[PDB]
Amino acid sequence: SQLLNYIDGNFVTSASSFANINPVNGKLISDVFEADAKQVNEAVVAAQNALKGPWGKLSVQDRAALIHKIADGIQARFEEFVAAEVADTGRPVHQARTLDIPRAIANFRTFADLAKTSHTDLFEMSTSDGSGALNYTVRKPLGVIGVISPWDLPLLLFTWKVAPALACGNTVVAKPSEESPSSATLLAEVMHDAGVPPGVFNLIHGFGKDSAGEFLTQHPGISALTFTGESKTGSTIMKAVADGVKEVSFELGGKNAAVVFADADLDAAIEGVLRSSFTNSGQVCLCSERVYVHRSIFDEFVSGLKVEAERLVVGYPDQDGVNMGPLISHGHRDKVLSYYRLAVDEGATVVTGGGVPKFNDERDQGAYVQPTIWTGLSDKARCVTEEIFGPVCHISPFDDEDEVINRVNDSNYGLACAIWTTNLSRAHRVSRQIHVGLVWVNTWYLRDLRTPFGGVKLSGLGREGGRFSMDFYSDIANICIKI
Amino acid sequence: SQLLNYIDGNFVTSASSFANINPVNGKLISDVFEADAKQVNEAVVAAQNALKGPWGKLSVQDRAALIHKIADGIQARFEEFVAAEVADTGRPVHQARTLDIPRAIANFRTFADLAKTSHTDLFEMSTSDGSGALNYTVRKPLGVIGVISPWDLPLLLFTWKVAPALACGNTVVAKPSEESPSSATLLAEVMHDAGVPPGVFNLIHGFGKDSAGEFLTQHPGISALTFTGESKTGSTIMKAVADGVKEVSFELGGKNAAVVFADADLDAAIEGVLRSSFTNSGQVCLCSERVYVHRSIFDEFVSGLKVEAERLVVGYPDQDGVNMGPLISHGHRDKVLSYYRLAVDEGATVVTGGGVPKFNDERDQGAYVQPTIWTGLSDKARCVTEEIFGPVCHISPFDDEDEVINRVNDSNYGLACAIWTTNLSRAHRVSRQIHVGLVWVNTWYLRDLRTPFGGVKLSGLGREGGRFSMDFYSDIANICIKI
Amino acid sequence: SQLLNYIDGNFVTSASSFANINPVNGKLISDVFEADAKQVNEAVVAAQNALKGPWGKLSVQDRAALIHKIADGIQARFEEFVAAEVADTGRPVHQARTLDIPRAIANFRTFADLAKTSHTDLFEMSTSDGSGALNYTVRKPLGVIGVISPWDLPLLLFTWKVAPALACGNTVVAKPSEESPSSATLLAEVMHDAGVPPGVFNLIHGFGKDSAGEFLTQHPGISALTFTGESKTGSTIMKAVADGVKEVSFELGGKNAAVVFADADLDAAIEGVLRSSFTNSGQVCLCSERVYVHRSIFDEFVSGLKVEAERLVVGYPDQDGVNMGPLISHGHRDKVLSYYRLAVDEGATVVTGGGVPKFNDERDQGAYVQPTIWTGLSDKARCVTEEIFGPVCHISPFDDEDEVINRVNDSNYGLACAIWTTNLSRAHRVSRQIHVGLVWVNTWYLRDLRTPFGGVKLSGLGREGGRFSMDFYSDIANICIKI
Amino acid sequence: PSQLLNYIDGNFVTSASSFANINPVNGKLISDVFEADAKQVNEAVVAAQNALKGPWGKLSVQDRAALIHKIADGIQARFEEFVAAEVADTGRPVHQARTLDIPRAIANFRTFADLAKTSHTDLFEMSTSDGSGALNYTVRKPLGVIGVISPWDLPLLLFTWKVAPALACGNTVVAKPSEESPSSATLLAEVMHDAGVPPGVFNLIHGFGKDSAGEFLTQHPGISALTFTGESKTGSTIMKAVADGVKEVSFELGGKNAAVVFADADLDAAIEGVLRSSFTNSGQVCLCSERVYVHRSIFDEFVSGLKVEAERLVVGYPDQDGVNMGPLISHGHRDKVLSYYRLAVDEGATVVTGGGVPKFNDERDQGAYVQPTIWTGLSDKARCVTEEIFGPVCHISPFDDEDEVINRVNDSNYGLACAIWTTNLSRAHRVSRQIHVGLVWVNTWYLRDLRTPFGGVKLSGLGREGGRFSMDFYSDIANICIKI
Ligand SMILES: NC(=O)c1ccc[n+]([C@@H]2O[C@H](COP(=O)([O-])OP(=O)(O)OC[C@H]3O[C@@H](n4cnc5c(N)ncnc54)[C@H](O)[C@@H]3O)[C@@H](O)[C@H]2O)c1
Ligand SMILES: NC(=O)c1ccc[n+]([C@@H]2O[C@H](COP(=O)([O-])OP(=O)(O)OC[C@H]3O[C@@H](n4cnc5c(N)ncnc54)[C@H](O)[C@@H]3O)[C@@H](O)[C@H]2O)c1
Ligand SMILES: O=C/C=C/C=C(/O)C(=O)O
Ligand SMILES: O=C/C=C\C=C(\O)C(=O)O
Ligand code: NA
Ligand code: NA
Ligand code: NA
């Protein structure tokens, strides 16, 4: 099985390839042609040229219709996409069928719709001579959008950037994660089959440093680099595009907290924190790795969660009742297990998990770990401050509202937070004081694609979603007419 | 005369001072205390702490009333502010009385008003359990805003940043240009006398590299760096805040064109290009330095502009019919005369100017140059592509509409453009195809503070003005309530 | 051959029927069942109850999907709808295929899209106790919308009300014009086949006074009456719903002007005024019946228009080069002919037309009149001030700009106006001074569904289109939470 | 004593007929008020039309905003004079006038002047067949002459609530305040004059409704809009009256508002809140609760608690120490309210407290006071539970189920406002969104942000005002489409 680049309307190989490994069993699923500097350039130039082609001449209605045909094209091959995401990542088949693929289809449809309904502004003004003037704004394509995406929700996060870039009439050069290159390749087939003009969408495979990713960010032909990944990678990219003063949008790491107040519906909160800690084996940026529970309910909470966690089925993506699959890679398991050990050395009490499960089959050749819960660590422990990106949470008691607010906020990260309380005043009062981009109250990972989405501090720069995407992926130009 | 820093409600001196020179006659105006890294730290920490004080507890209405009070304080000392801008820069007194100071006052009033009238968004959504969810957004202070500003319109551009920063409830550490520190210092006095709480507004004097400016961009305590200056400086600052992923807003250089079509009102166009090329002695980022005139009117346009340029009075700020003062500094003049030499070397015809005026009085010790017009250079000439920031324009003929649009856009910059035509379709057809942030038709430098403002390519990153400022200087936070 | 009412999911007949006549040849097309008062009540009650059924429980996304299905259902029977519109009205087949039916479909698609993308507002406020309060708004269904539509663009205008009513979650009782009932009836079939729940859409046929129309306006069960028709009918309806304080939205009559300045593209303006005066045989509310032409081009304009009018092909809807069909009915023809005679009695020169064409075939049994052009009437002539709604225009010369603006605005109507000029300043300067809801410059009948649309003075009440429709067809509720 | 004149075309003028202004505290004559006739209303409208073509029409948005801030400044500069005028007319407690009435009226002008400065309009690009495209842009122009007709419950607040956005949008105004409260509007005319507002821009006409200035105004072909606040019946009458001219209309009408106290409410706070919402301005605000529903489990405790607080209410002089309630607006209004007091007894209400008039043994016995009143035991169908009384009264009823009480609140021909008391997050949002009214408060009452849309549903109104909705209503929204 092979995954090729898609450049100027053609699938092409490269002088080098790398292995794509199924993390369920460590088996080789495909070879992936790594694009080189020359190929990246060819992609960017083709995207620049595609801006003056038929793509640039499409009305907003016609463009939106073609974007819906991309969406239709994915729906037509729905189960192939599901198989592709599962293979790369080992995620449960039910998760891919209900979350990953549907949300990616929704990204195209929503931004196609937004593009059709969006408008701009008119400002009337007085002048010295009494005749006045008119200022109006227009949205134009920004140009070539470089897209660099992670492996946690591969197609979803890929299409989260590609859909509005295309909806705004831009062209795209996109580099998916080396760990999850398959669904992105299928998408390039859908684009091609949908008749998306050559050069409008370009897919380059490869790595970051000294590979396609780096090359893309250094290429002077792009107009913007939108990125989702590690905070340190974002800082690196920001330096790379600095001489070109490229527009940037970064969605970076988090060490997200959940907070359970004494008046929470305890069962729902336990359920809630279970989902937020262990979904996708805790490999979601929005996962809660720190949890604060009111002292009066702390023991009862940790008990209930231990039970639920131990009922979780860790196995095959298609196994009956499965809840967790493997981590994305062996290298990633190494770093995660390394934190498991670091936690012990730091004084943690291992409430559950803290190692790898035993299968006595091919899965032992995979990259599984157990859902883990810690207690007993201090606020300054590395395991409570640094992002692990595994199925783990530490639970800590608290006593006062203002105290826990301060403790949640005592982070260099600021992506998201979940609060559990049944009290009206408390919900709104506490929520507004959490220094993050997204707060959920009595739920987790509910996403409305119209809302602004982003993080504060090291967790990012800018907002995307709804009008914020329509703004970022466009040139906003002001035209002033003297009358 | 001495200009002090203003840190945490106190005017403070520093270990070193530097010279503020009057560009009219080369004489010493004042000594300015240069903030060291320790003082910059002190300012940032005070700014952080002020967010937690009385300032942080003001209602939006009370915060707006206080900002209007700052404006009233400037107005109450209007002529002192006029005297200060004039002294630092040599700008004509009438310009300072009609443009610089009144627009600085308007910055505060406009953003105080916007702060009172702004609101956010409500999104309703359905959920699988049929109960639904509410998503609402809020605007919070981003935190401590670092402001670094240029010398071309000192108080105007300085308050362009500080006014929305404060209006959004942020605290500020601001570093004005070393060439123009005086009006900023008066502003600090207005702040103090208006009762702005200690730490909310902090003024640090100094240079950029290895000085106050650099130290500000490096301090981990800021949340954003908003900047107006050279494109190369912007790139440096982008790199400098990259590790901390600070929000950034950049308004950078330009090589702005004016286009004069055959159907222009010729005399209005001549007058318009005269203003756009020579206002503030060509030292405004929005100035035209490239001009394209239709072949049929080229000779007549050049002859007309030569006459008007030679009528310009270059002299004292309060001299009777004065139009132009000097350049900001001897150092800047050295750079400008170097470009004058380069133009001749590149084969230009000097239609007028090209040197320095001889006054035979104290002004000869100052930094004056002549308004200058070139013809005959190619589009590839350095003098036609690089920003000079002096009172100069090159004029070139054109034949065809699409041709001239391409020539305008063939630039690494894209700040502004001015177009002269009496034709309804032409005005709208052409302006939308110019790759810049701002197009004027039949005027120049009309600014409505509600409009988005900024540049493309090397001319900047992001937009400010109106709701764009209200969004940039705020944390936009999303709160999601499961019902 | 028989057109039934559609009430609570069932096609039902009535106690009496009336004749639907083909205006091409006077032949009977169908019998139409006239809804009585009890059936109108039945419709309103069924609509009230459907608010509480499954329709009320759809998410906005599901509701929007269903409205797209309705659009898809029209598209699937495209030619059937074309045949229906043509049969009732005699409009050229090409017009129905290109204007009428596609725009009816677009109505549904556009408001479905707007429903998905619309959101509401969040207001934060301070309170004495320092904890604050949150105000947010929501859009809810207004209730049962009563829709009463005219015969000029039957399906287009019908769906212009029905689409946003359904898009906003309302239920509907709609009464199309007795002159054009066929396409509305076909629409009811499409609703049925698409599975729109019973009672959500209800179609009642009949007349105005003492018939289905009046009864609908008097029913206390509706929440709003949206109407398009003559101004006097609007007044009648305003009184009828007064006791109920029903929400109202009126698009009434006009006497629209076209103005041609000396610098207009003469050929384009002649072509434009030809379309604006004679499209749909002058039976569009937006048609020009008053034309003002600058004196220097008056004779040339009139001579050119006469030539183009006499080239117009008046005939069968499927006659190969047909431009115009008949008027809507013999009764309407008699009214128009009465004005044709009044014009002559008022002193008009008949430049062309002024009577009925002789076909020497079945068309002579239809309701055709000639495209007519008048000159020589004063601004006080009844034929110059009262809406005729036939294929007619008076042409008058003018000399001054403020003069012609005055004569344009000197009217009790204010629907629309078209101005022809190539001058940038004049276009914007004059347009803003015309007291109408809509000005076109160098075109006519360009409609963007996002824009506000309506009249001033006798031409209407309120605005529809874009968010104005989303607001009118919705309850806007404010919810204020003390924290 | 005092005299109140009309203000037409920059001049204070008298009339052929006058009527009396009566202090409701003691029944004493305050002033004579000149009733404008048909001729004078016409003179006002025509002056307002001409004013649109004068210097007023030529001001920039910024200069017009500055002038409106000058009007607010003028009211502030005469603050205590305005307080005295609202109080004299209405008998409202001086503290209410000083903290609610007068400051809000000043805030009305300031808010809409600011909105005027910040507001902008829309740009729509579109594709065309020939591929050159087109641009649609919208502008806001003044609508024209706005007729304003206001009520007596919050005289200057509600008057300026219409007059401020009208002027902010560049309209001219002919305004007719309630015959029951003509004073503060007359003082506003003085402020306008002194502030240099051009003649014809603001015109003040005094009188009644039917066969007087109010009716004449609604009938004049010269106005562009009629904005109105008052009884629902009057709303309908006026809607018929402007129908022939198809005038723009905005109506804020009657209500029979409910308060709901759920079992998880902060009980003491709910008692306090319902006390305020039922008896503030002696129950004479359109936003007052007159129907109350309390969960069965806390019903008795709630009622006994409210009884205690209602009986500690001080009824008396507007400047009396700790006064909570002044008199009703007039003896005529009291007749109406007492009639409902009787009706409640006849329908079988238990009178928990009040139900009569207090005995003062001084001049206040010549005024129009009644007692704060609480009823129980009436059915949802009782007239006193369904008809707007507009006095200091509430009926309290128990309920058991959430959906039940939601249906009971909504079972009304009115739909102005509702207040909900609960400490539950889910409940506040779930229940609020189901209440068929324009405004719901949770755990409070009568908080107003001037930026929010405001209006009623069903008989309680037509349209919305506030923020962008006032900017839209008081403006011509015109679309200009340019083929490129
Ligand atoms: N803020 C969000 O919304 C969000 C969403 C999903 C994931 N994330 C985060 O992403 C991370 C997930 O792991 P990850 O390994 O995919 O992140 P990563 O930074 O290691 O790499 C992500 C992408 O960037 C590329 N890349 C790496 N180095 C590069 C370089 N020097 N130049 C250019 N491109 C380079 C990679 O090839 C990959 O495509 C976590 O930190 C997680 O929190 C954030
Ligand atoms: N402003 C606009 O956008 C617009 C658009 C299209 C047509 N129009 C106008 O419509 C008029 C032509 O159409 P028309 O002849 O069908 O108008 P019309 O007023 O005679 O009738 C229109 C509709 O109203 C119904 N109706 C008539 N009397 C009624 C009553 N007393 N109570 C309730 N309903 C009643 C009719 O049955 C019909 O359905 C022209 O004035 C034209 O300009 C205006
Ligand atoms: O509405 C009256 C005529 C305008 C035609 C349209 O396209 C429309 O109504 O949307
Ligand atoms: O408007 C009705 C009652 C008063 C509420 C307000 O404060 C207002 O209308 O602005
Ligand atoms: Na200097
Ligand atoms: Na017919
Ligand atoms: Na009185």
Side-chain angles (χ1 to χ4, degrees), chain A residues 308-321:
Chain A
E308 296 315 309
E310 289 178 341
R311 293 187 183 179
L312 296 180
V313 185
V314 185
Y316 287 100
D318 59 333
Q319 170 174 345
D320 330 82

mmCIF file of all heavy atoms in Angstrom, chain A residues 308-321:
data_model
loop_
_atom_site.group_PDB
_atom_site.id
_atom_site.type_symbol
_atom_site.label_atom_id
_atom_site.label_comp_id
_atom_site.label_asym_id
_atom_site.label_seq_id
_atom_site.Cartn_x
_atom_site.Cartn_y
_atom_site.Cartn_z
ATOM 1 N N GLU A 308 -15.241 3.134 36.967
ATOM 2 C CA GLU A 308 -15.591 3.356 35.573
ATOM 3 C C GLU A 308 -14.393 3.154 34.673
ATOM 4 O O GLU A 308 -14.510 2.561 33.606
ATOM 5 C CB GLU A 308 -16.189 4.748 35.397
ATOM 6 C CG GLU A 308 -17.502 4.912 36.136
ATOM 7 C CD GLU A 308 -18.441 3.723 35.928
ATOM 8 O OE1 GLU A 308 -18.667 3.331 34.760
ATOM 9 O OE2 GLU A 308 -18.953 3.177 36.933
ATOM 10 N N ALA A 309 -13.236 3.632 35.113
ATOM 11 C CA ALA A 309 -12.012 3.507 34.337
ATOM 12 C C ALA A 309 -11.635 2.042 34.143
ATOM 13 O O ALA A 309 -11.174 1.637 33.067
ATOM 14 C CB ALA A 309 -10.875 4.252 35.017
ATOM 15 N N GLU A 310 -11.819 1.250 35.191
ATOM 16 C CA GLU A 310 -11.459 -0.161 35.118
ATOM 17 C C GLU A 310 -12.434 -0.973 34.265
ATOM 18 O O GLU A 310 -12.080 -2.041 33.765
ATOM 19 C CB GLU A 310 -11.269 -0.742 36.526
ATOM 20 C CG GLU A 310 -9.997 -0.194 37.183
ATOM 21 C CD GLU A 310 -9.768 -0.687 38.603
ATOM 22 O OE1 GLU A 310 -10.737 -1.167 39.243
ATOM 23 O OE2 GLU A 310 -8.609 -0.582 39.073
ATOM 24 N N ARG A 311 -13.645 -0.453 34.077
ATOM 25 C CA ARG A 311 -14.603 -1.082 33.168
ATOM 26 C C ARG A 311 -14.315 -0.787 31.691
ATOM 27 O O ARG A 311 -14.937 -1.376 30.807
ATOM 28 C CB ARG A 311 -16.027 -0.641 33.495
ATOM 29 C CG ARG A 311 -16.552 -1.123 34.824
ATOM 30 C CD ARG A 311 -18.027 -0.773 34.967
ATOM 31 N NE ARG A 311 -18.558 -1.166 36.269
ATOM 32 C CZ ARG A 311 -19.812 -0.957 36.662
ATOM 33 N NH1 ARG A 311 -20.670 -0.351 35.846
ATOM 34 N NH2 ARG A 311 -20.209 -1.352 37.869
ATOM 35 N N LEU A 312 -13.384 0.122 31.420
ATOM 36 C CA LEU A 312 -13.098 0.511 30.042
ATOM 37 C C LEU A 312 -12.445 -0.625 29.280
ATOM 38 O O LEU A 312 -11.491 -1.237 29.761
ATOM 39 C CB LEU A 312 -12.180 1.730 29.995
ATOM 40 C CG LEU A 312 -12.751 3.015 30.592
ATOM 41 C CD1 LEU A 312 -11.733 4.135 30.468
ATOM 42 C CD2 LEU A 312 -14.060 3.374 29.901
ATOM 43 N N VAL A 313 -12.954 -0.885 28.080
ATOM 44 C CA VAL A 313 -12.436 -1.955 27.244
ATOM 45 C C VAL A 313 -11.343 -1.465 26.296
ATOM 46 O O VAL A 313 -11.597 -0.710 25.352
ATOM 47 C CB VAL A 313 -13.561 -2.630 26.438
ATOM 48 C CG1 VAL A 313 -13.013 -3.813 25.686
ATOM 49 C CG2 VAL A 313 -14.700 -3.049 27.353
ATOM 50 N N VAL A 314 -10.123 -1.904 26.563
ATOM 51 C CA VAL A 314 -8.963 -1.522 25.781
ATOM 52 C C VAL A 314 -8.620 -2.658 24.824
ATOM 53 O O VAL A 314 -8.152 -3.711 25.258
ATOM 54 C CB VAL A 314 -7.766 -1.275 26.707
ATOM 55 C CG1 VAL A 314 -6.561 -0.758 25.924
ATOM 56 C CG2 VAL A 314 -8.160 -0.319 27.831
ATOM 57 N N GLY A 315 -8.850 -2.459 23.526
ATOM 58 C CA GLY A 315 -8.656 -3.533 22.566
ATOM 59 C C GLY A 315 -8.754 -3.134 21.107
ATOM 60 O O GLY A 315 -8.336 -2.039 20.731
ATOM 61 N N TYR A 316 -9.293 -4.032 20.282
ATOM 62 C CA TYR A 316 -9.395 -3.795 18.842
ATOM 63 C C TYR A 316 -10.387 -2.682 18.510
ATOM 64 O O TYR A 316 -11.419 -2.541 19.175
ATOM 65 C CB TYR A 316 -9.786 -5.077 18.091
ATOM 66 C CG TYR A 316 -8.675 -6.099 18.005
ATOM 67 C CD1 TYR A 316 -8.640 -7.191 18.865
ATOM 68 C CD2 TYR A 316 -7.655 -5.969 17.066
ATOM 69 C CE1 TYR A 316 -7.623 -8.127 18.790
ATOM 70 C CE2 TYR A 316 -6.628 -6.900 16.984
ATOM 71 C CZ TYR A 316 -6.620 -7.978 17.849
ATOM 72 O OH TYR A 316 -5.609 -8.909 17.780
ATOM 73 N N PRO A 317 -10.082 -1.898 17.465
ATOM 74 C CA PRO A 317 -10.978 -0.811 17.056
ATOM 75 C C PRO A 317 -12.374 -1.336 16.729
ATOM 76 O O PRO A 317 -13.357 -0.610 16.877
ATOM 77 C CB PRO A 317 -10.303 -0.253 15.799
ATOM 78 C CG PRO A 317 -8.862 -0.608 15.950
ATOM 79 C CD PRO A 317 -8.838 -1.926 16.673
ATOM 80 N N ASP A 318 -12.464 -2.596 16.317
ATOM 81 C CA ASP A 318 -13.761 -3.178 15.977
ATOM 82 C C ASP A 318 -14.268 -4.183 17.015
ATOM 83 O O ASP A 318 -15.360 -4.744 16.870
ATOM 84 C CB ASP A 318 -13.748 -3.780 14.560
ATOM 85 C CG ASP A 318 -12.689 -4.865 14.378
ATOM 86 O OD1 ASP A 318 -11.660 -4.847 15.088
ATOM 87 O OD2 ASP A 318 -12.887 -5.736 13.503
ATOM 88 N N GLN A 319 -13.484 -4.391 18.070
ATOM 89 C CA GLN A 319 -13.895 -5.264 19.165
ATOM 90 C C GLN A 319 -15.198 -4.769 19.788
ATOM 91 O O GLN A 319 -15.447 -3.572 19.834
ATOM 92 C CB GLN A 319 -12.787 -5.348 20.214
ATOM 93 C CG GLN A 319 -13.184 -6.033 21.519
ATOM 94 C CD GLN A 319 -12.004 -6.210 22.451
ATOM 95 O OE1 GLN A 319 -10.851 -6.075 22.040
ATOM 96 N NE2 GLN A 319 -12.284 -6.525 23.707
ATOM 97 N N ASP A 320 -16.040 -5.688 20.248
ATOM 98 C CA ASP A 320 -17.319 -5.309 20.842
ATOM 99 C C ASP A 320 -17.105 -4.544 22.139
ATOM 100 O O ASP A 320 -16.307 -4.950 22.991
ATOM 101 C CB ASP A 320 -18.177 -6.544 21.111
ATOM 102 C CG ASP A 320 -17.898 -7.669 20.129
ATOM 103 O OD1 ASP A 320 -16.905 -8.406 20.343
ATOM 104 O OD2 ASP A 320 -18.664 -7.813 19.145
ATOM 105 N N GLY A 321 -17.820 -3.430 22.272
ATOM 106 C CA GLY A 321 -17.787 -2.618 23.477
ATOM 107 C C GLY A 321 -16.497 -1.851 23.719
ATOM 108 O O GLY A 321 -16.359 -1.200 24.754
#
